[PDB]
């Protein structure tokens, strides 16, 4: 059945995103079982993103030629098996756990690249959009459920190992159901022209800034709140609250952005970059207040997280509109792929590691006590507002050349034919 295929693939995506953030929710515990520092605890996410980034184009290449059901099932089976077998590593071996993260990255890259094509080819011009929307609205839900599941199982069983064993069972089940309920099924001349398009380049830099901030914050906040609450001498509910909040900010941001853009398109033809830039600057103003409120109050930190969280996600669905506003129809396949790769390279490939590295560098030159353990991370997370302000400036520089770029595109399209 077609509805069964859509439902099973959507559940697969939710399970896909639940398995990236079960490591953040137990980060504090890992740093005691293996005897590492912040430098060592950033690598667990840095290597994951590097492997995913390099794997994705190859699996896109493969998924055109060969059986797709075979490749999806093999990917799910592989990363479920590796995730399960990773929870037995002895204490003396830390590099093995980093290798495990690399392998899980490969396994998820395969599925994330291939599933949208299978959903796309089943449906027609009208109902395809709704099915893709239901597919993509599994990102906030799975992301939050990662924090909640990890912390809850660790709370229940009493040993963080158990947070790495609940998911592989559900992986194995769906890996077999995706074999039963689913029905079967020069790029250089583009690069020489996509680097003279100023709106395209500036939009790509702005999206990279968004990725930097999102990756760093989304890995490091739950631990920083715990350190702050230890300093106040009034203290794993923090990760539960963070998951509950993110589950709803994900949807609210996108609704807000679409509404504002739709209204502003009937006043001028520069609506998309202006809305994006205003949202980025507001989010920077509100983000820079957590690192001040948390020294005094805790509920203020949560409210600031809510507002900045919401305004940082508003430009999620408007960058695709910019890309198809300024690029002619026979270069969009190349443009999307190059943009996504570059977003990962300058984004959160090496962001969490850098935060941890700076925290340790600050702390080695000062007495190591809980106060300075908290203050070092506080003063190392100042780099998120700075790059968000850069992102706002880049969206303004996009809005400066938007119209001339559209005019060039129309001349090319009508000349070619």
């Amino acid at each position: 059945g077609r509805g069964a295929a859509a439902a099973i693939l959507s559940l697969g995506n939710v399970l896909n995103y639940l398995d990236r953030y079960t490591v953040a929710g137990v980060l504090l515990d890992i740093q005691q079982h293996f005897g590492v520092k912040d430098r060592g605890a950033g690598l667990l996410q840095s290597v994951f993103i590097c492997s995913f980034m390099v794997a994705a184009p190859i699996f896109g290449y493969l998924g055109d030629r060969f059986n797709r059901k075979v490749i999806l099932s093999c990917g799910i089976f592989f990363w479920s098996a590796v995730t399960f077998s990773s929870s037995f590593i002895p204490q003396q071996y830390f590099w093995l756990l980093v290798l495990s993260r690399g392998l899980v990255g490969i396994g998820e890259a395969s599925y994330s690249t291939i599933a949208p094509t299978i959903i796309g080819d089943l449906f027609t011009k009208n109902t395809r959009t709704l099915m893709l929307s239901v597919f993509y609205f599994a990102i906030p839900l799975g992301s939050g459920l990662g924090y909640i599941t990890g912390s809850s199982v660790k709370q229940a069983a009493g040993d963080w190992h158990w947070a790495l064993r609940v998911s592989p069972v559900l992986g194995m089940i769906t890996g077999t159901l995706i074999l039963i309920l689913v029905p079967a099924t020069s790029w250089l001349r583009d690069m020489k022209a996509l680097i003279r398009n100023r709106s395209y380049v500036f939009s790509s830099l702005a999206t990279s800034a968004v990725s930097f901030a999102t990756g760093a914050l989304g890995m490091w906040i739950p631990l920083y709140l715990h350190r702050a609450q230890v300093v106040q001498k009034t203290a794993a509910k923090d990760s539960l609250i963070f998951g509950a909040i993110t589950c709803f900010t994900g949807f609210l941001g996108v609704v807000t952005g679409a509404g504002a853009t739709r209204w502003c398109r009937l006043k001028t033809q520069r609506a998309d970059p202006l809305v994006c830039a205003v949202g980025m600057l507001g989010s920077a103003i509100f983000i820079c207040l957590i690192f001040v409120a948390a020294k005094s109050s805790i509920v203020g930190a949560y409210i600031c997280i809510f507002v900045g969280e919401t305004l940082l996600f508003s430009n999620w669905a408007i960058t695709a509109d910019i890309l198809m506003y300024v690029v002619i129809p026979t270069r969009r396949a190349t443009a999307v792929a190059l943009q996504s790769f570059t977003s990962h390279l300058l984004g959160d490939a090496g962001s969490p590691y850098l935060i941890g590295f700076i925290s340790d560098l600050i702390r080695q030159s000062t007495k190591d006590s809980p106060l300075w353990e908290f203050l070092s991370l506080g003063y190392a997370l100042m780099l998120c507002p700075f790059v968000v302000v850069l992102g706002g400036m880049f969206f303004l520089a996009t809005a400066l050349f938007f119209v001339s770029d559209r005019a060039r595109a129309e001349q090319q399209v009508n000349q070619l034919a």
Partner: nanobody, 126 residues
């Protein structure tokens, strides 16, 4: 919505001029214009379109050399000048606005338009 004006009863060899306007202070300049038609026995088909910045116009194969489309976004209007009408031009004419660029072989596609009008009929007598 958008609003269409004009339309009526003409004789072969006549001429006609239709207009489309946006009531209010709405500007309709992001992308805004094309003209479509529908007849009793058949399916809707694009008749012509005009572009956002340059003033680049496209027509279908059956109306080339007779129709002319033009834009004026100081006052938010668009005009269609029809000439040399013939008994198989009898239909209802519509006005639409979407986002894809202006190109040939984009005319016929009407499943990706943001705003539609309500129609104005033209009858060519004998």
């Amino acid at each position: 919505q958008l609003v269409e004006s004009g339309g009526g009863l003409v004789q072969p060899g006549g001429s006609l001029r239709l207009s489309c306007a946006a009531p209010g202070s709405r500007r309709f300049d992001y992308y805004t214009l094309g003209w479509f038609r529908q007849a009793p026995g058949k399916e809707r088909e694009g008749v012509s379109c005009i572009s956002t910045v340059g003033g680049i116009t496209n027509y279908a194969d059956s109306v080339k050399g007779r129709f002319i489309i033009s834009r004026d976004n100081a006052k938010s209007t668009v005009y269609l000048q029809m000439n040399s009408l013939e008994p198989e031009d009898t239909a209802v004419y519509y006005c639409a606005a979407g986002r894809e660029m202006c190109a040939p072989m984009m005319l016929g596609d009407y499943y990706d338009m943001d705003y539609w009008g309500k129609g104005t009929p033209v009858t060519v007598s004998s």
